[PDB]
Each structure stands twice: as structure tokens, then as C-alpha cells.
Design a protein around this motif. Structure first.
Motif, PDB file in Angstrom:
ATOM      1  N   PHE A 143     -10.609  -9.526   0.018  1.00 52.34           N
ATOM      2  CA  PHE A 143      -9.306 -10.132  -0.218  1.00 52.34           C
ATOM      3  C   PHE A 143      -9.308 -11.551   0.345  1.00 52.34           C
ATOM      4  O   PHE A 143      -9.699 -11.799   1.487  1.00 52.34           O
ATOM      5  N   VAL A 144      -8.853 -12.471  -0.508  1.00 52.25           N
ATOM      6  CA  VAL A 144      -9.045 -13.899  -0.339  1.00 52.25           C
ATOM      7  C   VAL A 144      -7.694 -14.576  -0.511  1.00 52.25           C
ATOM      8  O   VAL A 144      -7.028 -14.386  -1.533  1.00 52.25           O
ATOM      9  N   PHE A 145      -7.301 -15.356   0.507  1.00 53.91           N
ATOM     10  CA  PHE A 145      -6.071 -16.131   0.448  1.00 53.91           C
ATOM     11  C   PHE A 145      -6.265 -17.422   1.236  1.00 53.91           C
ATOM     12  O   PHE A 145      -7.244 -17.561   1.972  1.00 53.91           O
ATOM     13  N   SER A 146      -5.348 -18.368   0.994  1.00 54.49           N
ATOM     14  CA  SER A 146      -5.272 -19.613   1.745  1.00 54.49           C
ATOM     15  C   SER A 146      -4.261 -19.442   2.870  1.00 54.49           C
ATOM     16  O   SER A 146      -3.088 -19.200   2.609  1.00 54.49           O
ATOM     17  N   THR A 165       8.801  -0.756   6.822  1.00 50.50           N
ATOM     18  CA  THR A 165       7.921  -1.153   7.910  1.00 50.50           C
ATOM     19  C   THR A 165       6.475  -0.908   7.486  1.00 50.50           C
ATOM     20  O   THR A 165       6.183   0.126   6.916  1.00 50.50           O
ATOM     21  N   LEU A 166       5.551  -1.824   7.785  1.00 48.10           N
ATOM     22  CA  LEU A 166       4.174  -1.741   7.299  1.00 48.10           C
ATOM     23  C   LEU A 166       3.205  -1.716   8.482  1.00 48.10           C
ATOM     24  O   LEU A 166       3.447  -2.295   9.544  1.00 48.10           O
ATOM     25  N   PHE A 167       2.042  -1.117   8.203  1.00 44.10           N
ATOM     26  CA  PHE A 167       0.911  -1.069   9.112  1.00 44.10           C
ATOM     27  C   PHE A 167      -0.326  -1.545   8.357  1.00 44.10           C
ATOM     28  O   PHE A 167      -0.530  -1.163   7.197  1.00 44.10           O
ATOM     29  N   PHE A 168      -1.169  -2.324   9.041  1.00 46.90           N
ATOM     30  CA  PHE A 168      -2.417  -2.767   8.448  1.00 46.90           C
ATOM     31  C   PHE A 168      -3.555  -2.704   9.449  1.00 46.90           C
ATOM     32  O   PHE A 168      -3.388  -3.019  10.618  1.00 46.90           O
ATOM     33  N   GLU A 169      -4.718  -2.306   8.937  1.00 46.55           N
ATOM     34  CA  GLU A 169      -5.979  -2.523   9.609  1.00 46.55           C
ATOM     35  C   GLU A 169      -6.649  -3.688   8.895  1.00 46.55           C
ATOM     36  O   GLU A 169      -6.759  -3.698   7.670  1.00 46.55           O
ATOM     37  N   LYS A 207       4.240   6.989   1.808  1.00 47.91           N
ATOM     38  CA  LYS A 207       4.343   7.215   0.379  1.00 47.91           C
ATOM     39  C   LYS A 207       3.366   6.298  -0.366  1.00 47.91           C
ATOM     40  O   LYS A 207       2.989   6.632  -1.490  1.00 47.91           O
ATOM     41  N   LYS A 208       2.937   5.168   0.226  1.00 48.94           N
ATOM     42  CA  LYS A 208       1.967   4.311  -0.454  1.00 48.94           C
ATOM     43  C   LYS A 208       0.880   3.841   0.500  1.00 48.94           C
ATOM     44  O   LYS A 208       1.182   3.555   1.649  1.00 48.94           O
ATOM     45  N   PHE A 209      -0.362   3.786  -0.016  1.00 51.43           N
ATOM     46  CA  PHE A 209      -1.537   3.326   0.708  1.00 51.43           C
ATOM     47  C   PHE A 209      -2.323   2.354  -0.176  1.00 51.43           C
ATOM     48  O   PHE A 209      -2.562   2.627  -1.343  1.00 51.43           O
ATOM     49  N   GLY A 211      13.185  -5.604  -0.354  1.00 52.87           N
ATOM     50  CA  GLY A 211      11.965  -4.861  -0.590  1.00 52.87           C
ATOM     51  C   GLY A 211      11.198  -5.480  -1.746  1.00 52.87           C
ATOM     52  O   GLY A 211      11.343  -6.662  -2.018  1.00 52.87           O
ATOM     53  N   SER A 212      10.391  -4.660  -2.422  1.00 47.24           N
ATOM     54  CA  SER A 212       9.701  -5.077  -3.636  1.00 47.24           C
ATOM     55  C   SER A 212       9.448  -3.846  -4.485  1.00 47.24           C
ATOM     56  O   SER A 212       8.363  -3.292  -4.478  1.00 47.24           O
ATOM     57  N   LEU A 213      10.503  -3.384  -5.140  1.00 41.80           N
ATOM     58  CA  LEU A 213      10.477  -2.122  -5.845  1.00 41.80           C
ATOM     59  C   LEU A 213       9.820  -2.321  -7.196  1.00 41.80           C
ATOM     60  O   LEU A 213       9.953  -3.378  -7.802  1.00 41.80           O
ATOM     61  N   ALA A 269       7.773  -8.812   6.453  1.00 45.96           N
ATOM     62  CA  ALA A 269       7.106  -8.288   5.273  1.00 45.96           C
ATOM     63  C   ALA A 269       7.955  -8.574   4.032  1.00 45.96           C
ATOM     64  O   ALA A 269       7.906  -9.706   3.532  1.00 45.96           O
ATOM     65  N   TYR A 270       8.729  -7.574   3.569  1.00 43.08           N
ATOM     66  CA  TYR A 270       9.437  -7.645   2.291  1.00 43.08           C
ATOM     67  C   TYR A 270      10.957  -7.540   2.454  1.00 43.08           C
ATOM     68  O   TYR A 270      11.679  -7.533   1.465  1.00 43.08           O
ATOM     69  N   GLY A 271      11.448  -7.423   3.692  1.00 40.97           N
ATOM     70  CA  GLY A 271      12.854  -7.643   4.000  1.00 40.97           C
ATOM     71  C   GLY A 271      13.758  -6.596   3.370  1.00 40.97           C
ATOM     72  O   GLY A 271      13.326  -5.491   3.051  1.00 40.97           O
TER      73      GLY A 271
HETATM   74  C1  LIG Z   1      -3.524 -14.342  -3.015  1.00 47.93           C
HETATM   75  C2  LIG Z   1      -3.190 -12.916  -2.618  1.00 47.93           C
HETATM   76  C3  LIG Z   1      -1.831 -12.788  -3.162  1.00 47.93           C
HETATM   77  N1  LIG Z   1      -1.290 -11.414  -2.946  1.00 47.93           N
HETATM   78  C4  LIG Z   1      -0.181 -11.189  -2.185  1.00 47.93           C
HETATM   79  C5  LIG Z   1       0.073  -9.883  -2.225  1.00 47.93           C
HETATM   80  C6  LIG Z   1       1.242  -9.169  -1.545  1.00 47.93           C
HETATM   81  O1  LIG Z   1       0.718  -8.403  -0.499  1.00 47.93           O
HETATM   82  C7  LIG Z   1       0.767  -8.885   0.743  1.00 47.93           C
HETATM   83  O2  LIG Z   1       1.079 -10.048   0.993  1.00 47.93           O
HETATM   84  C8  LIG Z   1       0.349  -7.992   1.753  1.00 47.93           C
HETATM   85  C9  LIG Z   1      -0.688  -8.678   2.638  1.00 47.93           C
HETATM   86  C10 LIG Z   1      -1.931  -8.966   1.759  1.00 47.93           C
HETATM   87  C11 LIG Z   1      -2.491  -7.651   1.367  1.00 47.93           C
HETATM   88  C12 LIG Z   1      -1.573  -6.920   0.462  1.00 47.93           C
HETATM   89  N2  LIG Z   1      -0.208  -6.806   1.044  1.00 47.93           N
HETATM   90  C13 LIG Z   1       0.584  -5.746   0.900  1.00 47.93           C
HETATM   91  O3  LIG Z   1       1.697  -5.736   1.380  1.00 47.93           O
HETATM   92  C14 LIG Z   1       0.121  -4.578   0.077  1.00 47.93           C
HETATM   93  C15 LIG Z   1       0.248  -4.921  -1.297  1.00 47.93           C
HETATM   94  C16 LIG Z   1      -0.833  -4.746  -2.185  1.00 47.93           C
HETATM   95  C17 LIG Z   1      -0.738  -5.028  -3.533  1.00 47.93           C
HETATM   96  O4  LIG Z   1      -1.734  -4.874  -4.444  1.00 47.93           O
HETATM   97  C18 LIG Z   1      -3.023  -5.123  -3.902  1.00 47.93           C
HETATM   98  C19 LIG Z   1       0.456  -5.507  -4.031  1.00 47.93           C
HETATM   99  O5  LIG Z   1       0.574  -5.814  -5.403  1.00 47.93           O
HETATM  100  C20 LIG Z   1       0.085  -7.134  -5.599  1.00 47.93           C
HETATM  101  C21 LIG Z   1       1.535  -5.685  -3.172  1.00 47.93           C
HETATM  102  O6  LIG Z   1       2.645  -6.160  -3.784  1.00 47.93           O
HETATM  103  C22 LIG Z   1       3.780  -6.392  -2.932  1.00 47.93           C
HETATM  104  C23 LIG Z   1       1.443  -5.378  -1.808  1.00 47.93           C
HETATM  105  C24 LIG Z   1       1.017  -3.328   0.338  1.00 47.93           C
HETATM  106  C25 LIG Z   1       0.791  -2.787   1.790  1.00 47.93           C
HETATM  107  C26 LIG Z   1       1.667  -1.514   1.915  1.00 47.93           C
HETATM  108  C27 LIG Z   1       1.064  -0.425   1.075  1.00 47.93           C
HETATM  109  C28 LIG Z   1       1.254  -0.749  -0.450  1.00 47.93           C
HETATM  110  C29 LIG Z   1       0.850  -2.228  -0.761  1.00 47.93           C
HETATM  111  C30 LIG Z   1      -0.835  -9.297  -3.026  1.00 47.93           C
HETATM  112  N3  LIG Z   1      -1.695 -10.241  -3.483  1.00 47.93           N
END
Ligand SMILES: CCCn1cc(COC(=O)[C@@H]2CCCCN2C(=O)[C@H](c2cc(OC)c(OC)c(OC)c2)C2CCCCC2)cn1
Length: 128
Positions: A65-68, A115-119, A53-55, A105-107, A100-102
Motif C-alpha cells: 500500500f502506497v500513499f503520499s 472506531t478502527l484498529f490497524f497493524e 464486521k469488516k476486516f 462514516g463511509s457507508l 478516521a471517518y467521523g
Molecule cells: C492512495 C490510497 C488511497 N486510499 C485511501 C483509502 C481509505 O482508507 C484509509 O485511508 C485507511 C488507511 C489506509 C488503508 C485503508 N484504510 C481503511 O480505512 C480501510 C479501507 C480499505 C479500503 O479498501 C482497501 C477502502 O476502500 C477503498 C476503504 O474505504 C474507506 C477503507 C478500512 C479499515 C477498516 C476495515 C475496512 C476497511 C483507501 N485507499
């Protein structure tokens, strides 16, 4: 099915060994060096949820995409998974919701118990 292939042929990289994060490598990187906690990391990724349902992609810009790493700025699965990757690597992760989001979730984006998949492609890392 890339996700099924991982579910069947993927390595369990959790410590608890609960199959919560499964990995297959798709392009071998360069070197032996993989990043440390507190490294700024640069990746391109594509992500979907199992519902179909979401990509999401970083590719929805030129900006990578940049993180610590290891600072919990992302889901636990990424702090685990990316830390196993070498510069120039590409890999597939399948993630049970507890990494992931347990249950909350994160509605409305992510449902309960998703359950999530990533490349993931790892471009580079540097000490902050
Ligand atoms: C400093 C980066 C901080 N950040 C954390 C996130 C939360 O996302 C995640 O931690 C994981 C892993 C990093 C890539 C994005 N992530 C996601 O789960 C995506 C994700 C992208 C998002 O937007 C890019 C997002 O909104 C911020 C989000 O919120 C939970 C989650 C999901 C993957 C399933 C398909 C829909 C989105 C987004 N930005």
C-alpha cells in the motif's frame, strides 16, 4: 486483546492530546529517520473495525500500500501515525472516529462513528 492492550498501554500521539490516535510499537525499526510530508510511503497493513464486521488487508495482494504522506490521501490517523514510524517498524494504532471517518462514516463499508484498529508495517519511503 491487541486493541485493549493499546487502549490501556498505548501512547497518545495526537497534538490536541484527546487520545484519538493511540500507538504501541511491536517491532523496532532501523535508524532514526522517519518520513516527511510529501514522501511516497510503502506499507503492509491489516485493519479491522471495532464492530468486528469488516476486516481489510493489503496482504490481499503482493502489491504493498502506497500513499503520499501528509497529503490527506488517507485518514488523518495514518498521516499522523505513519509519520512517527521508522523504516522496518511495525505498530498498532487505535483510532477514535474523529481521526478516521467521523459521524458521517463511509457507508456501506464503515458505519457512523466507527472506531478502527490497524497493524502497520513500514517498508520504506522516498522523496517524490
Ligand atoms: C492512495 C490510497 C488511497 N486510499 C485511501 C483509502 C481509505 O482508507 C484509509 O485511508 C485507511 C488507511 C489506509 C488503508 C485503508 N484504510 C481503511 O480505512 C480501510 C479501507 C480499505 C479500503 O479498501 C482497501 C477502502 O476502500 C477503498 C476503504 O474505504 C474507506 C477503507 C478500512 C479499515 C477498516 C476495515 C475496512 C476497511 C483507501 N485507499
Amino acid at each position: 486483546g491487541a486493541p485493549a492492550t493499546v487502549t490501556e498501554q498505548g501512547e497518545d500521539i495526537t497534538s490536541k492530546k484527546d487520545r484519538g490516535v493511540l500507538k504501541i510499537v511491536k517491532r523496532v525499526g532501523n535508524g532514526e529517520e522517519t518520513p516527511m510530508i510529501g514522501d511516497k510511503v510503502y506499507v503492509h497493513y491489516k485493519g479491522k473495525l471495532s464492530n468486528g464486521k469488516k476486516f481489510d488487508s493489503s496482504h490481499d495482494r503482493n502489491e504493498p500500500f502506497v500513499f503520499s504522506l501528509g497529503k490527506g490521501q488517507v485518514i488523518k490517523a495514518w498521516d499522523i501515525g505513519v509519520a512517527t514510524m521508522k523504516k522496518g517498524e511495525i505498530a498498532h494504532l487505535l483510532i477514535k472516529p474523529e481521526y478516521a471517518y467521523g459521524s458521517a462514516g463511509s457507508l456501506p463499508k464503515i458505519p457512523s462513528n466507527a472506531t478502527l484498529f490497524f497493524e502497520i508495517e513500514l517498508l520504506d519511503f522516498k522523496g517524490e
